[PDB]
Amino acid sequence: GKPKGLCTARKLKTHRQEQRWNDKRYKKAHIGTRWKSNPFGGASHAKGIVLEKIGVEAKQPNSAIRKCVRVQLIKNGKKITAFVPNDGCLNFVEENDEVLVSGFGRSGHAVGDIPGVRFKIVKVANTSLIALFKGKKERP
Amino acid sequence: ARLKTVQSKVTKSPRRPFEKERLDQELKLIGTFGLKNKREVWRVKYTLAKVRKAARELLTLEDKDPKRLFEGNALLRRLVKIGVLDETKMKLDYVLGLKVEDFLERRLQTQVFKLGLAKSIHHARILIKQHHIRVRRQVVDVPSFIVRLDSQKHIDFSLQSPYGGGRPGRVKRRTLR
Amino acid sequence: HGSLARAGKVRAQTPKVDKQDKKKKKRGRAFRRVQYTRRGPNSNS
Amino acid sequence: VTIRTRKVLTNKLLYRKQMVVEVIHPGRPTVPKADIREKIAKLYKTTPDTVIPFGFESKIGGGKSKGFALVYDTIDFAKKFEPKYRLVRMGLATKVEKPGRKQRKERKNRQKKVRGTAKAKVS
RNA sequence: GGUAACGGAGAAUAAGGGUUCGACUCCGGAGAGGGAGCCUUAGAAACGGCUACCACGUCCAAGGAAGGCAGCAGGCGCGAAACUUAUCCACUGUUGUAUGAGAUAGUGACUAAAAAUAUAGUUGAAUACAAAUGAUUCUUCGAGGAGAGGGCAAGUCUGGUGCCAGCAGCCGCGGUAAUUCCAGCUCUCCUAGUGUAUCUCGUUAUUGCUGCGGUUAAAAAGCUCGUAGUUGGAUCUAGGUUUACCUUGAAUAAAUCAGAGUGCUCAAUACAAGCGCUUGCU
RNA sequence: UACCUGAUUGAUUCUGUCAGCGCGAUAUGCUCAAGUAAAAGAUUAAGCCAUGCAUGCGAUUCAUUGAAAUUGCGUAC
Numbered sequence A: 001g002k003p004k005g006l007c008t009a010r011k012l013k014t015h016r017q018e019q020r021w022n023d024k025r026y027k028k029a030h031i032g033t034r035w036k037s038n039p040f041g042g043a044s045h046a047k048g049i050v051l052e053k054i055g056v057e058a059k060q061p062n063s064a065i066r067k068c069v070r071v072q073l074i075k076n077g078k079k080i081t082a083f084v085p086n087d088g089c090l091n092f093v094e095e096n097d098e099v100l101v102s103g104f105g106r107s108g109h110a111v112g113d114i115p116g117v118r119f120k121i122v123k124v125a126n127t128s129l130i131a132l133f134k135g136k137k138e139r140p
Numbered sequence B: 001a002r003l004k005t006v007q008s009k010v011t012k013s014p015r016r017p018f019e020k021e022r023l024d025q026e027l028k029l030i031g032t033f034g035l036k037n038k039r040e041v042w043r044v045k046y047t048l049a050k051v052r053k054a055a056r057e058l059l060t061l062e063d064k065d066p067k068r069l070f071e072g073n074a075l076l077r078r079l080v081k082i083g084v085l086d087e088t089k090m091k092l093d094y095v096l097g098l099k100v101e102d103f104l105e106r107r108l109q110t111q112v113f114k115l116g117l118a119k120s121i122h123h124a125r126i127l128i129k130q131h132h133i134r135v136r137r138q139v140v141d142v143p144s145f146i147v148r149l150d151s152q153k154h155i156d157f158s159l160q161s162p163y164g165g166g167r168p169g170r171v172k173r174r175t176l177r
Numbered sequence C: 001h002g003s004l005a006r007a008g009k010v011r012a013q014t015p016k017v018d019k020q021d022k023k024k025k026k027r028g029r030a031f032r033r034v035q036y037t038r039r040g041p042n043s044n045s
Numbered sequence D: 001v002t003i004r005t006r007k008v009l010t011n012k013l014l015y016r017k018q019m020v021v022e023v024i025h026p027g028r029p030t031v032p033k034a035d036i037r038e039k040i041a042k043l044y045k046t047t048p049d050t051v052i053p054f055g056f057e058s059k060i061g062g063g064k065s066k067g068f069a070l071v072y073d074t075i076d077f078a079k080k081f082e083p084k085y086r087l088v089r090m091g092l093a094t095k096v097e098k099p100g101r102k103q104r105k106e107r108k109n110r111q112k113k114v115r116g117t118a119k120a121k122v123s
Numbered sequence E: 001g002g003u004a005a006c007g008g009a010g011a012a013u014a015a016g017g018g019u020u021c022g023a024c025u026c027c028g029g030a031g032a033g034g035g036a037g038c039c040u041u042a043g044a045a046a047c048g049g050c051u052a053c054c055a056c057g058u059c060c061a062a063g064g065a066a067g068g069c070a071g072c073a074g075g076c077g078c079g080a081a082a083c084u085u086a087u088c089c090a091c092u093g094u095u096g097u098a099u100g101a102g103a104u105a106g107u108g109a110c111u112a113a114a115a116a117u118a119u120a121g122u123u124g125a126a127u128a129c130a131a132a133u134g135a136u137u138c139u140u141c142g143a144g145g146a147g148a149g150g151g152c153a154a155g156u157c158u159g160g161u162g163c164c165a166g167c168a169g170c171c172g173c174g175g176u177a178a179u180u181c182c183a184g185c186u187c188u189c190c191u192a193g194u195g196u197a198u199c200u201c202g203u204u205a206u207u208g209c210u211g212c213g214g215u216u217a218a219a220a221a222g223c224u225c226g227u228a229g230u231u232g233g234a235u236c237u238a239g240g241u242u243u244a245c246c247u248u249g250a251a252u253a254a255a256u257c258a259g260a261g262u263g264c265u266c267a268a269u270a271c272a273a274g275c276g277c278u279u280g281c282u
Numbered sequence F: 001u002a003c004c005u006g007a008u009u010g011a012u013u014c015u016g017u018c019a020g021c022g023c024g025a026u027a028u029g030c031u032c033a034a035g036u037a038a039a040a041g042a043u044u045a046a047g048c049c050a051u052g053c054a055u056g057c058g059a060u061u062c063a064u065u066g067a068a069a070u071u072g073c074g075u076a077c
Helices: A009-020 A024-030 A129-134 B020-032 B038-059 B066-082 B100-105 B108-114 B121-129 B170-176 C029-038 D033-043 D084-090 D101-112
Strands: A045-057 A065-073 A079-083 A098-103 A119-124 B133-135 B155-157 D002-011 D016-024 D051-058 D065-072
Touching: A045 A079, A065 A098, A079 A098, A119 A129, B020 B038, B020 B100, B020 C029, B038 B066, B038 B100, B108 B121, B108 B133, B108 B155, B121 C029, D002 D033, D016 D033, D016 D051, D033 D051, D033 D065, D051 D084
Parallel strands: A079 A119
Antiparallel strands: A045 A065, A045 A098, A065 A079, A098 A119, B133 B155, D002 D016, D016 D065, D051 D065
């Protein structure tokens, strides 16, 4: 059982702090290497340069080739793989393009049947991918 | 230099976005009292919630507590003047009994059509918008304006509005010219 | 199977259809009034 | 056009009288300050140029409207205890044309670079 | 040692107990590219003061002479990320002509309140202002974003495609009869807003003091001795010297939060105002 | 308002997390009748800065009211 004495405040506080580190959320939010490990460095979006277009085989039981793109981030030069959402939108993305990349939705974890991809494309050539898909705007 | 400007929110979103019971109940409130959107009804829900919470917090205290006395009479006073509480029902145990309909009734929009100045509640609203009503010699253009008890019997057409004596509207003037 | 070269296949194949026209639906309070009077909603089958 | 004066106070240490003026102009536009001035002068049996209305804001839908007025004992006290812009507005004084702030500042800075009597010449 | 650390007043969330944050208008501290040294002074280790070195610039007729926007406005870089090289001392203040302090207008879907699309624009006046602008009084003419299997409100309608293209936060849809993709039509939610990404709080009794769990789901040290720490039996006036603790006061900046009053036309706000009759009272 | 719902199984009850759901901050997509208040180069680069401004006003008046200059005061707010 936990201590219950009237003069055990130090033990209770110190034990709580010691055991908070065994918590994934607390450790993930206070470890100290978060900025150097996260590709975005704690940001929500990041600009990058497209290096190549790749296809990722969907996980089972699904079958498809998800059209992803390899990007190098400008702010730190780290390489990531980002998903190009919507149908036939890989055509809009040319090699050596400036793309805005955002998280995929699950805070650094893969989403759906796409394995190992944690980012998606929001803008290409300073144009919204959704706008291009909907026909609102055209390629600069 | 310039200090922080004070702002407050008057609406709280429902915890569950989609429940048929709540959706139907709120759509009926929009129906009877002609309102514009769900924010209009959430505003009244929020004010009623504040009133009820204050009453409950006071009632936690005994009867003759100084704070209980002062705040309780103040709250009952305000409700009476708005016309939402019963002037015989002077107690917080009974202020913890009101509904959103009580407040929604005291809106200017409802009274405009209730007193016959307009046919439908939508008519009431578009009149209030087009500046055809006045209150105690004041042209009010806010359909949400609450009508105090004193103001209840001093609401008639604007002294200028073509339906209250004034230059004919655009349609009439076009026809005349 | 998928090849990375068939991107935008179905949207290209899709037959093109045009839209229609309708009177500007009532907006704001009027739409809510129409809703209240009208009151599954889309029971095609 | 019913002009009414309330909260009238006598300020001898400034030789005037301060009052809140309210005008009722149902249907009519906002009362011009000259018209208000004449009515207040008649009200206080005083010259129509020893009364200073100002700060007249108009309530909605016509009718009511409020402002302030200063009744002055005489024109010398008036154009002694008064900002220049008020007098210019009412014609008691005349505006003095002045160069803009930017150009005055630049001229001052340029003069700072010159010593002796050539400062007045430099421009 | 680390801090992606200026402290506080406070902010977000919020049964209660809390968790997180706080560069930022008020208070205190520190700095003026990095250090160091000093003149003047009541007050400075001042930088819109000087002196040197370091780094980096500017003008030279090559002998020399200079610079410090983390002030306002602008420019370049950096980035996901942030405004006009505009008008004035009329306002609050500085000892009061001077005040990029301060006040105005510009850009401004940060944001907060109130509201039009059914039953706005536009003309000349006044007003306002330091001049304006804009509102306020008069007068001329005169609807979009997500969705539609479940969670979760809403189609087993039609056409294309056949594990492809794609959708899908999660569970899952698609293999030639797809309510889930691409479209048309219809509906649903909210609505001048509505979605996406990262993060904080709730949800979460999944950090548990209130208040978790340890036979088998993660978790009792192989066992014992033992210092610090924590915790320690009953017992002194019932009847007929110290502490700890509790009660009540004192000392305890505003702004913010709660809250009293007060028709800014309501509200968010603001701190006002309300009465006679004029020389006014509260 | 002291609240939960979907997902491990042929089905069941648990542990448990993931996901949903409400608010707020920042960025951003699409879109925006008129108005009223109003934040706004903090985050990274206390990085670098073209150009304008941001600190000046009793005694001494042989200039033409008061210039110039010497004083004094302020520029430590």
